[PDB]
PDB file of N, CA, C and O and ligand atoms in Angstrom:
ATOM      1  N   UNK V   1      21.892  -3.421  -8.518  1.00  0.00           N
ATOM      2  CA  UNK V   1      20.977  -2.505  -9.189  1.00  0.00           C
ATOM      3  C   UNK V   1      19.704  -2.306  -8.374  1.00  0.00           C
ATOM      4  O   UNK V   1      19.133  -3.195  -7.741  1.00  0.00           O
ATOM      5  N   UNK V   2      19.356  -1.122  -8.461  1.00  0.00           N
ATOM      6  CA  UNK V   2      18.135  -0.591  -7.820  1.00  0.00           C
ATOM      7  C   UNK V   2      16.929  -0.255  -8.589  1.00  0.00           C
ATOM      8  O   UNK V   2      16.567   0.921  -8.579  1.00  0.00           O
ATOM      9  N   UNK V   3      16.360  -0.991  -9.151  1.00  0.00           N
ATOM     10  CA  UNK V   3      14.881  -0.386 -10.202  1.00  0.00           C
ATOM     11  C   UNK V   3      14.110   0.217  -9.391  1.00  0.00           C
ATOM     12  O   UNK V   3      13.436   1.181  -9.755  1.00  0.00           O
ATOM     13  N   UNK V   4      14.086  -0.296  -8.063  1.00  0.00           N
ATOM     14  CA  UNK V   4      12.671   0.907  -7.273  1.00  0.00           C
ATOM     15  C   UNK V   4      13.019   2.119  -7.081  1.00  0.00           C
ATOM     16  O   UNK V   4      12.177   3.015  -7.015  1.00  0.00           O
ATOM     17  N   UNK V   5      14.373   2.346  -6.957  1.00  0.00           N
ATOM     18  CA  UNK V   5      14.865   3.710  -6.906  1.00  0.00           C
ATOM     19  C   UNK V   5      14.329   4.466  -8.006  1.00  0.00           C
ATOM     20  O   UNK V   5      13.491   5.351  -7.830  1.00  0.00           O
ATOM     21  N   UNK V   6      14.776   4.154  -9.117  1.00  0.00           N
ATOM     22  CA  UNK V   6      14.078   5.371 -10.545  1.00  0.00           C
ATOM     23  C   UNK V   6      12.966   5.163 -10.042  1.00  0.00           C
ATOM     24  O   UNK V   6      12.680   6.018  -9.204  1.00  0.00           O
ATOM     25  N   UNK V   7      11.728   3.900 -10.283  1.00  0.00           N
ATOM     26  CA  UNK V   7      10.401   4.209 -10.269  1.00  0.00           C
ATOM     27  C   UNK V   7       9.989   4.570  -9.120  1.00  0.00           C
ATOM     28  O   UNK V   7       8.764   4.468  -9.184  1.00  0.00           O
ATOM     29  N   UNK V   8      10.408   5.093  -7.647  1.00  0.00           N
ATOM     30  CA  UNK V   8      10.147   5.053  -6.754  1.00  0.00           C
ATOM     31  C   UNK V   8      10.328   6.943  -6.934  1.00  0.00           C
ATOM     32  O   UNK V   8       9.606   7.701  -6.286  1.00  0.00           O
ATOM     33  N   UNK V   9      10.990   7.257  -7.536  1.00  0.00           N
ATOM     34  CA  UNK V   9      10.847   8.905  -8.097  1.00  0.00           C
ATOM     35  C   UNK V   9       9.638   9.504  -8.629  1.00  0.00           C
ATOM     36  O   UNK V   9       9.253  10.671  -8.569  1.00  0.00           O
ATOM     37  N   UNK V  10       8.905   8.072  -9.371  1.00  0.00           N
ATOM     38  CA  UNK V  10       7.591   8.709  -9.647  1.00  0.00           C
ATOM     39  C   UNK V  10       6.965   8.681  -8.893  1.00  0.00           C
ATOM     40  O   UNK V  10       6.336   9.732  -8.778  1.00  0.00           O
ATOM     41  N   UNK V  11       6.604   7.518  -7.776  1.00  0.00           N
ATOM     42  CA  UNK V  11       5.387   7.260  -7.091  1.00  0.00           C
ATOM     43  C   UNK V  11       5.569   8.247  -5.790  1.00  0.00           C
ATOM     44  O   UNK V  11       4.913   8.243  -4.748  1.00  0.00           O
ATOM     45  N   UNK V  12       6.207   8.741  -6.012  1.00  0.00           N
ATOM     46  CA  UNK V  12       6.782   9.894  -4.805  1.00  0.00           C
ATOM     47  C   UNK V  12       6.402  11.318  -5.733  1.00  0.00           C
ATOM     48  O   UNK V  12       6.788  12.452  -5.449  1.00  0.00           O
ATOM     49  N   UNK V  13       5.987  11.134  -6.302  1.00  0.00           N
ATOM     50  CA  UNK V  13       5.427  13.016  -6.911  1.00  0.00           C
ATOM     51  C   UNK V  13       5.605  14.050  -6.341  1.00  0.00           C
ATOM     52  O   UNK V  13       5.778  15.146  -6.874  1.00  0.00           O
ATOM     53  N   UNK V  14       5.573  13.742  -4.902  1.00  0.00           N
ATOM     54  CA  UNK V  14       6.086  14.706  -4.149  1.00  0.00           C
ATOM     55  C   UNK V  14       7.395  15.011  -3.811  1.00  0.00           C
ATOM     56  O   UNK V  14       7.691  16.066  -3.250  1.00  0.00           O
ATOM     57  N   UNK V  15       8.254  14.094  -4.137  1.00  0.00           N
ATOM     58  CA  UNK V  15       9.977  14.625  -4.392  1.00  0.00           C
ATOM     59  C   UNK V  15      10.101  14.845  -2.654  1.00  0.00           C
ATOM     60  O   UNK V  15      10.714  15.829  -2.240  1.00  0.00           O
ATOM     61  N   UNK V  16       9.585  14.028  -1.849  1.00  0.00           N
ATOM     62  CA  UNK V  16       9.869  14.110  -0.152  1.00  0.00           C
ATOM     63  C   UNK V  16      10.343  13.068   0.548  1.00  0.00           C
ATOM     64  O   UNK V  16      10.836  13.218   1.666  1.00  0.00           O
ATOM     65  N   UNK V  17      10.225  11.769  -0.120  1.00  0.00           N
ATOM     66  CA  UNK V  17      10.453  10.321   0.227  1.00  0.00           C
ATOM     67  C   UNK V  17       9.409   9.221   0.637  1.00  0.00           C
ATOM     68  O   UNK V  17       9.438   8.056   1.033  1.00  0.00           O
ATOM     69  N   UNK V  18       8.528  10.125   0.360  1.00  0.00           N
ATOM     70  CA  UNK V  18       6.992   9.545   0.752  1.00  0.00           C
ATOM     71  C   UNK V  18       6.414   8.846  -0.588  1.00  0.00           C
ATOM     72  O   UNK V  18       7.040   8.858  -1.648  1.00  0.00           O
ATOM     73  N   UNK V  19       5.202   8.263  -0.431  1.00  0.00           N
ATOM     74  CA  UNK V  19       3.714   8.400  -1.282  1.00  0.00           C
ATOM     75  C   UNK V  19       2.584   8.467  -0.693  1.00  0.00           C
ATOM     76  O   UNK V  19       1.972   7.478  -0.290  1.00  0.00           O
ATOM     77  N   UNK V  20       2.220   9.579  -0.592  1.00  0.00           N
ATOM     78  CA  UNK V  20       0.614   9.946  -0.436  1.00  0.00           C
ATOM     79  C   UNK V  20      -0.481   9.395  -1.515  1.00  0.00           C
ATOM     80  O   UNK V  20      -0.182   8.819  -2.561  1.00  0.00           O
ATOM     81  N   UNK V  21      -2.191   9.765  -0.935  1.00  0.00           N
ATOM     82  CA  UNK V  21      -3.062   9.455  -1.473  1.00  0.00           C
ATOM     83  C   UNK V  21      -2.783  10.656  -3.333  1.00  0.00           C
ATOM     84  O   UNK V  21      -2.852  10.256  -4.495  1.00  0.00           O
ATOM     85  N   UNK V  22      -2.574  11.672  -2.958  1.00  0.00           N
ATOM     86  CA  UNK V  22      -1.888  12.796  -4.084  1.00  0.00           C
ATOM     87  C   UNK V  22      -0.832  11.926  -5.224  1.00  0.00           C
ATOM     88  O   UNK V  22      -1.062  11.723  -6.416  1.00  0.00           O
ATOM     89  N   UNK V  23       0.019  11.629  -4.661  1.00  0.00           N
ATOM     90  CA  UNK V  23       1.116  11.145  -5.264  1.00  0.00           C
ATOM     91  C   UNK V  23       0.635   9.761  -5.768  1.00  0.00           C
ATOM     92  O   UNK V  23       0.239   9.483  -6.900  1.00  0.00           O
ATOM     93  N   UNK V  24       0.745   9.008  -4.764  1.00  0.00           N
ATOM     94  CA  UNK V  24       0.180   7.440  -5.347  1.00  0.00           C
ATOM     95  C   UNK V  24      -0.866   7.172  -6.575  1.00  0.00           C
ATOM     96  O   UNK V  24      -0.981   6.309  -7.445  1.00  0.00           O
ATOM     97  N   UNK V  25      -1.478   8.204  -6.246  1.00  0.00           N
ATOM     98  CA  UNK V  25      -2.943   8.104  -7.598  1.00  0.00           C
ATOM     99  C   UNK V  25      -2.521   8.090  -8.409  1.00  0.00           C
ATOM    100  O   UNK V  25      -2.985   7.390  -9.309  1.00  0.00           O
ATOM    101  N   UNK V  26      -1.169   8.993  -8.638  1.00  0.00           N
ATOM    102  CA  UNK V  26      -1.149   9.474 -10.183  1.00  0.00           C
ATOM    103  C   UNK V  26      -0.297   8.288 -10.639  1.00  0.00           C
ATOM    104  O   UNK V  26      -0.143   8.270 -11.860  1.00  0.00           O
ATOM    105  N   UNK V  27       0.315   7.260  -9.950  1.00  0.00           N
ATOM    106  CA  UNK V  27       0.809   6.575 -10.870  1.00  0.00           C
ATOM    107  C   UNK V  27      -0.439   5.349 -10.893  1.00  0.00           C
ATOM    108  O   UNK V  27      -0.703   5.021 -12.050  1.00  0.00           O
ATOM    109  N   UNK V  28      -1.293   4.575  -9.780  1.00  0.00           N
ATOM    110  CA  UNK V  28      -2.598   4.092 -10.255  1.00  0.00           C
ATOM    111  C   UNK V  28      -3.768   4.291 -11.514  1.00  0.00           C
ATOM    112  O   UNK V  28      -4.552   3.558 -12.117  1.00  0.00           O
ATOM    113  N   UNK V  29      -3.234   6.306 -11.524  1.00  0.00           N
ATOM    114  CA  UNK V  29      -4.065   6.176 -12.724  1.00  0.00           C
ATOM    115  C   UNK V  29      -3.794   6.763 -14.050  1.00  0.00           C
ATOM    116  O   UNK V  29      -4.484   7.140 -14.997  1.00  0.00           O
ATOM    117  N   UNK V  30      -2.242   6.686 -13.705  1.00  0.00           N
ATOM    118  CA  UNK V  30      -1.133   6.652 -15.059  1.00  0.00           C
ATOM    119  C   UNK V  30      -1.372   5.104 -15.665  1.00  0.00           C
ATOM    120  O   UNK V  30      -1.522   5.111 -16.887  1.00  0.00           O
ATOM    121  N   UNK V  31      -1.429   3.921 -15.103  1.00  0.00           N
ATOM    122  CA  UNK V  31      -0.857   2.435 -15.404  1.00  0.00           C
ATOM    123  C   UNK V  31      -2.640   1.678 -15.242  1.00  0.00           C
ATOM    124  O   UNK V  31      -3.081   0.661 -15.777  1.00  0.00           O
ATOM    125  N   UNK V  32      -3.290   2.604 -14.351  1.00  0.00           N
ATOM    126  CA  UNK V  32      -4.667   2.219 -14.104  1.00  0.00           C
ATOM    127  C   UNK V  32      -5.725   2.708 -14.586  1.00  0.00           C
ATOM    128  O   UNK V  32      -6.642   2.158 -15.197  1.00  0.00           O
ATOM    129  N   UNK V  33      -5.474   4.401 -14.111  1.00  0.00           N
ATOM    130  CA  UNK V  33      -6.229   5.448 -14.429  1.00  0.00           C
ATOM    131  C   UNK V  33      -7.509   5.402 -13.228  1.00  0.00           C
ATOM    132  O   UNK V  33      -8.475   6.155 -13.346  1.00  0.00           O
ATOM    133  N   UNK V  34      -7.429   4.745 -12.445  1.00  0.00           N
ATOM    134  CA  UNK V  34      -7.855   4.669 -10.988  1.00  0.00           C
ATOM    135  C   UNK V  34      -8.043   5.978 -10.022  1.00  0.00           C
ATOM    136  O   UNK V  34      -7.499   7.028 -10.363  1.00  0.00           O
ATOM    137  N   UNK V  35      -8.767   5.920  -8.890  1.00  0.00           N
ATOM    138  CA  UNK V  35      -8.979   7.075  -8.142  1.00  0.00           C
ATOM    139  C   UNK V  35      -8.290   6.670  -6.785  1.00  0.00           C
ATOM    140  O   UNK V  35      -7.999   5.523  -6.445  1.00  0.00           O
ATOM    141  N   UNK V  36      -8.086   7.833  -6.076  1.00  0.00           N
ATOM    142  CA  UNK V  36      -8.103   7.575  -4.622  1.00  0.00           C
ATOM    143  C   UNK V  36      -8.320   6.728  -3.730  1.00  0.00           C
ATOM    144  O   UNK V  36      -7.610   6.364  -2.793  1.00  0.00           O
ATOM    145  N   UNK V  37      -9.386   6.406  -4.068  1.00  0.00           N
ATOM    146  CA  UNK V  37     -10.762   5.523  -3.544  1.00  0.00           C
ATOM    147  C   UNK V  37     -10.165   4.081  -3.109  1.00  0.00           C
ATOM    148  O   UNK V  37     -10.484   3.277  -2.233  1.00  0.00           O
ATOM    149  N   UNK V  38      -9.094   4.105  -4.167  1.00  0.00           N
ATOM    150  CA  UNK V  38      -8.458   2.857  -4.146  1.00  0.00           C
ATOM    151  C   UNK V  38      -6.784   2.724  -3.629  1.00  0.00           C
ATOM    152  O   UNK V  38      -6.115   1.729  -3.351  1.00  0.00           O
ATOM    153  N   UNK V  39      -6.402   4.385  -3.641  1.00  0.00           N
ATOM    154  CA  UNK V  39      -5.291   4.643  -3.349  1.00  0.00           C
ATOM    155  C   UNK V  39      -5.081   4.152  -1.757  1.00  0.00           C
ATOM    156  O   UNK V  39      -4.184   3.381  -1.414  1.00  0.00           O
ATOM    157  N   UNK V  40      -5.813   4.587  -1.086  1.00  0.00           N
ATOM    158  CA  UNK V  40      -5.595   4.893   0.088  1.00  0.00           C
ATOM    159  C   UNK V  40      -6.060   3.460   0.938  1.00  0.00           C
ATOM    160  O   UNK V  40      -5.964   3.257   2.148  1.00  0.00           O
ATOM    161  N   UNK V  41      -6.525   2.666   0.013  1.00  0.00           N
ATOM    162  CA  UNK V  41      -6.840   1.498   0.539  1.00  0.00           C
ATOM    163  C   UNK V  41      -5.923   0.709  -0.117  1.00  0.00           C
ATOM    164  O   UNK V  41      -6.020  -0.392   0.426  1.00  0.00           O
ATOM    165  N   UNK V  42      -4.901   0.641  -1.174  1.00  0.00           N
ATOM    166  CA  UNK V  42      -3.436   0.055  -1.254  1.00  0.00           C
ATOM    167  C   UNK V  42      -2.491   0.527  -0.761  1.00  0.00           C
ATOM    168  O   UNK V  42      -1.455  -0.087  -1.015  1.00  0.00           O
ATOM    169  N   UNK V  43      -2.363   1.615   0.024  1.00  0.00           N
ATOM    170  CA  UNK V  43      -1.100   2.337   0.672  1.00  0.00           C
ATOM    171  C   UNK V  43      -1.513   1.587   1.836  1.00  0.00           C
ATOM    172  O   UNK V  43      -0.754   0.675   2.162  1.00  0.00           O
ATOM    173  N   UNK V  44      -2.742   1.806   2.662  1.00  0.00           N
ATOM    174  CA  UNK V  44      -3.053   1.205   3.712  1.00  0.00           C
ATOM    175  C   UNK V  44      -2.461  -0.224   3.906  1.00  0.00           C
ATOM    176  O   UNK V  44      -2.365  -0.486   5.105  1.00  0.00           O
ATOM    177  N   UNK V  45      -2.142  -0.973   3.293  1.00  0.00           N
ATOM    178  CA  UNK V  45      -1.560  -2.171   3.253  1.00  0.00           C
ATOM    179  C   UNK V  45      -0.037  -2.329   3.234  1.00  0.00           C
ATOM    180  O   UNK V  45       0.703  -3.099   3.846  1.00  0.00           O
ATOM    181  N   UNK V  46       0.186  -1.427   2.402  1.00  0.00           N
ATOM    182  CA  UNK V  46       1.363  -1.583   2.267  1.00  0.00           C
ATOM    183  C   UNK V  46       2.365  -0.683   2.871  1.00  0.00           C
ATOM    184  O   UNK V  46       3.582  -0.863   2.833  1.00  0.00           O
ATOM    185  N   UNK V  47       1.544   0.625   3.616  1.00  0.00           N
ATOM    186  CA  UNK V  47       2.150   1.177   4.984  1.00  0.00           C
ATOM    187  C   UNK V  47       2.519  -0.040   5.800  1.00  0.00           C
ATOM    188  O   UNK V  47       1.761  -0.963   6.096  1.00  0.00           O
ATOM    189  N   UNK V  48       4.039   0.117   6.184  1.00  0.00           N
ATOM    190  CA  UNK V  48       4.324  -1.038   7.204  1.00  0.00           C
ATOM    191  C   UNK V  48       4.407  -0.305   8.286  1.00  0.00           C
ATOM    192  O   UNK V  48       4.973  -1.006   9.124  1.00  0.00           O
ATOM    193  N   UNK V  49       4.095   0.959   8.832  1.00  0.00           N
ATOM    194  CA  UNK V  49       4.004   1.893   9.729  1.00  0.00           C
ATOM    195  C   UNK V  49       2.764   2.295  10.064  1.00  0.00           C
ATOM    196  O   UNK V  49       2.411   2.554  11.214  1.00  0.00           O
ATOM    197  N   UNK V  50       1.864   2.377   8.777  1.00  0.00           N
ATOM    198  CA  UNK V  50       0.514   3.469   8.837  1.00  0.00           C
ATOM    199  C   UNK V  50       0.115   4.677   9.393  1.00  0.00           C
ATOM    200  O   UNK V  50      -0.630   5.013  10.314  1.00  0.00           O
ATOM    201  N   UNK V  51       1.240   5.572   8.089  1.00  0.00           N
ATOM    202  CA  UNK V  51       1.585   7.199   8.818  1.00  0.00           C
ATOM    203  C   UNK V  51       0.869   7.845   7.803  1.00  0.00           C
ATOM    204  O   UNK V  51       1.531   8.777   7.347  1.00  0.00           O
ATOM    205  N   UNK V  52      -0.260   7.709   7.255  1.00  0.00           N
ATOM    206  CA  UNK V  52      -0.234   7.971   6.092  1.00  0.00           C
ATOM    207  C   UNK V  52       0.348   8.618   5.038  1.00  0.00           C
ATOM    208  O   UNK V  52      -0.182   9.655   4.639  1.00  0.00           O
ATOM    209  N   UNK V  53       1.369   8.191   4.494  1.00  0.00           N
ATOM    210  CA  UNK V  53       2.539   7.798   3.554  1.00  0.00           C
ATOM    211  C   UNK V  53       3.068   6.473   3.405  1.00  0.00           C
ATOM    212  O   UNK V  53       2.840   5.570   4.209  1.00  0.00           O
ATOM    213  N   UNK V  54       3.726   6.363   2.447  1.00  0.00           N
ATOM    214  CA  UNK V  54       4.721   4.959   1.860  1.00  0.00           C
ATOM    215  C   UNK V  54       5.917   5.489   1.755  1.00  0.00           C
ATOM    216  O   UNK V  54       6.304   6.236   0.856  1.00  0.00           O
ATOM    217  N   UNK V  55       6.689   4.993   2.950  1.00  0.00           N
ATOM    218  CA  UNK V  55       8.011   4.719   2.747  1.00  0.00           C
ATOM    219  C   UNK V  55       9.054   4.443   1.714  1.00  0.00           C
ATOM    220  O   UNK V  55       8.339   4.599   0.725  1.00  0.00           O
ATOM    221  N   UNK V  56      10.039   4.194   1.308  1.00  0.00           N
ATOM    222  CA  UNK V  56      10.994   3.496   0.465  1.00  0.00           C
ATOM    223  C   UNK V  56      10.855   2.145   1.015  1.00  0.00           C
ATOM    224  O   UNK V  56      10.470   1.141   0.416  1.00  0.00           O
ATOM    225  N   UNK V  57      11.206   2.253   2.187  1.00  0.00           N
ATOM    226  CA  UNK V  57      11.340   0.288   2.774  1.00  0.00           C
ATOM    227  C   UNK V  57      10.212  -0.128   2.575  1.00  0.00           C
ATOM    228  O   UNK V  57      10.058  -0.668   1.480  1.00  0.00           O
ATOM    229  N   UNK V  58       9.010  -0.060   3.490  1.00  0.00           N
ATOM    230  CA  UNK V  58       8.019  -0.368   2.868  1.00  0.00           C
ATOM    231  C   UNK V  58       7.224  -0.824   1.508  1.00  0.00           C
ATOM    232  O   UNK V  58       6.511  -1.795   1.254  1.00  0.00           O
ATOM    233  N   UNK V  59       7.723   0.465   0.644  1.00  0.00           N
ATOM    234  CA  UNK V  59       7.125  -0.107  -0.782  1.00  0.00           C
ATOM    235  C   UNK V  59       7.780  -1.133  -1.129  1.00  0.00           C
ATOM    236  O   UNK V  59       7.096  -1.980  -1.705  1.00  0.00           O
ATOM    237  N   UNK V  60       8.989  -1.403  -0.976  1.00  0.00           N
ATOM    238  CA  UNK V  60       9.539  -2.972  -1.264  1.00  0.00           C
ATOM    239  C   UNK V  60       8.891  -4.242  -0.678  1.00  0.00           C
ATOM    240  O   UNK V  60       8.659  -5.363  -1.131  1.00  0.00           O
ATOM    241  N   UNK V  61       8.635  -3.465   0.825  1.00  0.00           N
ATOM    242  CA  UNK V  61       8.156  -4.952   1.463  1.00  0.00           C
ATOM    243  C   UNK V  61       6.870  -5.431   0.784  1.00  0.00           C
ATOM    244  O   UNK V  61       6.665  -6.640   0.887  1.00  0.00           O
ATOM    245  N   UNK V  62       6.083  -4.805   0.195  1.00  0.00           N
ATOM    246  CA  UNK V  62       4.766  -4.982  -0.324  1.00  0.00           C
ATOM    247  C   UNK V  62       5.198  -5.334  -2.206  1.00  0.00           C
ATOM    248  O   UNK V  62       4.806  -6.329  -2.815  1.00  0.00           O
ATOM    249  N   UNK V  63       5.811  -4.550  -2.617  1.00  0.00           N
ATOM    250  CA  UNK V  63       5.544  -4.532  -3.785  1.00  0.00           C
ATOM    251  C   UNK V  63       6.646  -6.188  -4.453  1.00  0.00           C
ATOM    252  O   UNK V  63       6.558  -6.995  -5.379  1.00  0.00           O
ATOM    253  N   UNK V  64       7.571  -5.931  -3.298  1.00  0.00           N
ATOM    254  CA  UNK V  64       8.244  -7.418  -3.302  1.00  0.00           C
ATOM    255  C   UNK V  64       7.401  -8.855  -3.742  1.00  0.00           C
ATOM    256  O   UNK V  64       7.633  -9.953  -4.247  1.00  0.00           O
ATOM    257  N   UNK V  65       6.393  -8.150  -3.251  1.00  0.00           N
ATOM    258  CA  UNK V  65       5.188  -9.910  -2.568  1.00  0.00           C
ATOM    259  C   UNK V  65       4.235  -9.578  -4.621  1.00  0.00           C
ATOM    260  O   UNK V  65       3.440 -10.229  -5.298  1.00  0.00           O
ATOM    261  N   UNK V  66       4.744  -8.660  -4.748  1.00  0.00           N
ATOM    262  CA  UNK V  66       4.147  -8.141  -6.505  1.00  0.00           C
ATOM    263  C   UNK V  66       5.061  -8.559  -7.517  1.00  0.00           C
ATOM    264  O   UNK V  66       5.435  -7.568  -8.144  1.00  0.00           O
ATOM    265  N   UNK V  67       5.600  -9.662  -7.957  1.00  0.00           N
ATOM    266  CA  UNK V  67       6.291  -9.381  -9.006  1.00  0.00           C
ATOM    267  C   UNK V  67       5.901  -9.210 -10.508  1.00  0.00           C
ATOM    268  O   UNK V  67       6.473  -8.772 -11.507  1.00  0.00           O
ATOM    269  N   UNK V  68       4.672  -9.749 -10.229  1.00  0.00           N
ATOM    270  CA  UNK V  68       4.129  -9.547 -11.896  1.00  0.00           C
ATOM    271  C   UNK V  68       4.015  -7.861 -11.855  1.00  0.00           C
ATOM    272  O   UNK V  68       3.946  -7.560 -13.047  1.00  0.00           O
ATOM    273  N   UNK V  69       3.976  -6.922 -11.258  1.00  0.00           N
ATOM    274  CA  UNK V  69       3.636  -5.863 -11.076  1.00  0.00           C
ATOM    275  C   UNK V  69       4.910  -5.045 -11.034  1.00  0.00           C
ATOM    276  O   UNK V  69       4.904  -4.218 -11.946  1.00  0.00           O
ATOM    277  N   UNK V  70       6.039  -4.992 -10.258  1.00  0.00           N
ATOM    278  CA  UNK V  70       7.293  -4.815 -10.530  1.00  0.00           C
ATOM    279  C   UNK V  70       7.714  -4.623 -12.090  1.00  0.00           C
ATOM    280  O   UNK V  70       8.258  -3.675 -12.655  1.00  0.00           O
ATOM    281  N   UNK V  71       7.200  -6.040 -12.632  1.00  0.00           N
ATOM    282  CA  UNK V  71       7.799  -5.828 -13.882  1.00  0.00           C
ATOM    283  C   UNK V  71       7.087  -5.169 -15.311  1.00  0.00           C
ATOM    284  O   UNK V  71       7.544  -5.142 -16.454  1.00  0.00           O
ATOM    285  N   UNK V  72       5.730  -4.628 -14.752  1.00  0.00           N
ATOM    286  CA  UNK V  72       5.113  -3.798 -15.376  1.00  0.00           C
ATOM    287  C   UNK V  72       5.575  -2.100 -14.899  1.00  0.00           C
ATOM    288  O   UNK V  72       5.639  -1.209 -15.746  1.00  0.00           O
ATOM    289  N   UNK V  73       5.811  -1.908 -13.719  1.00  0.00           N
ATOM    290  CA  UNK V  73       5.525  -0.642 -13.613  1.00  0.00           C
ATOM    291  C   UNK V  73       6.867  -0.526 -13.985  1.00  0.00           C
ATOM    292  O   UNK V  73       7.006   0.684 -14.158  1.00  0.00           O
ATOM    293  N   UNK V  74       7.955  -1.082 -14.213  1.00  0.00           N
ATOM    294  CA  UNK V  74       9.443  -1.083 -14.167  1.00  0.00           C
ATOM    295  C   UNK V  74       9.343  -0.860 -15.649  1.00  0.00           C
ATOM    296  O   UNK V  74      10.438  -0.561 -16.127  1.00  0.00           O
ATOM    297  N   UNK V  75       8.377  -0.913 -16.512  1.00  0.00           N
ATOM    298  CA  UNK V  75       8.368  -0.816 -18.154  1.00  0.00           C
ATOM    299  C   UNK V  75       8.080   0.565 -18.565  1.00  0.00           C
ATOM    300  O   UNK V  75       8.289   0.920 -19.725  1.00  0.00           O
ATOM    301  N   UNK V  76       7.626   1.337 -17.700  1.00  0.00           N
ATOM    302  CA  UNK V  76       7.048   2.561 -18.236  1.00  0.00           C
ATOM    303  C   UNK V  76       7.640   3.392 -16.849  1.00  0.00           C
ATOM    304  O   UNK V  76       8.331   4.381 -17.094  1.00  0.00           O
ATOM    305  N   UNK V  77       7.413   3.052 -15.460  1.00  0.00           N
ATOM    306  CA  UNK V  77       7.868   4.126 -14.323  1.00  0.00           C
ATOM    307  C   UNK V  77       9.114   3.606 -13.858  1.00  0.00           C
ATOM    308  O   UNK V  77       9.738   4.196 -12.975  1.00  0.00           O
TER     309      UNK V  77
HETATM  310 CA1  LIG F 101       6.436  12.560  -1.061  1.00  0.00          CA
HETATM  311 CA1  LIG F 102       4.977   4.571   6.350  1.00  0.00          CA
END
């Protein structure tokens, strides 16, 4: 089973395979309600490339090291 796959549909808003500062926000400030401000300084990390975008592989490698977080965003995204 793949759970990042469905929620990985949202954090991709853009329907391209990415997450941008655009895309990423809205689920920070769907679950947060957070800005940019903060987007682009958690993608920054968790870019394992730093193209500005988030990968599929990537968001695992980071969000992996998250599990209390996994199993929140996995409740609603
Ligand atoms: Ca995208
Ligand atoms: Ca990347």
């Amino acid at each position: 089973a793949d759970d990042m796959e469905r929620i990985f549909k949202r954090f991709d808003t853009n329907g391209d395979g990415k997450i941008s500062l655009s895309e990423l926000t809205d689920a920070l400030r769907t679950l947060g309600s957070t800005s940019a401000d903060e987007v682009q300084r958690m993608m920054a990390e968790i870019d394992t490339d730093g193209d500005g975008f988030i990968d599929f592989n990537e968001f695992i490698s980071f969000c992996n090291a998250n599990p209390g977080l996994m199993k929140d965003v996995a409740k609603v995204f």
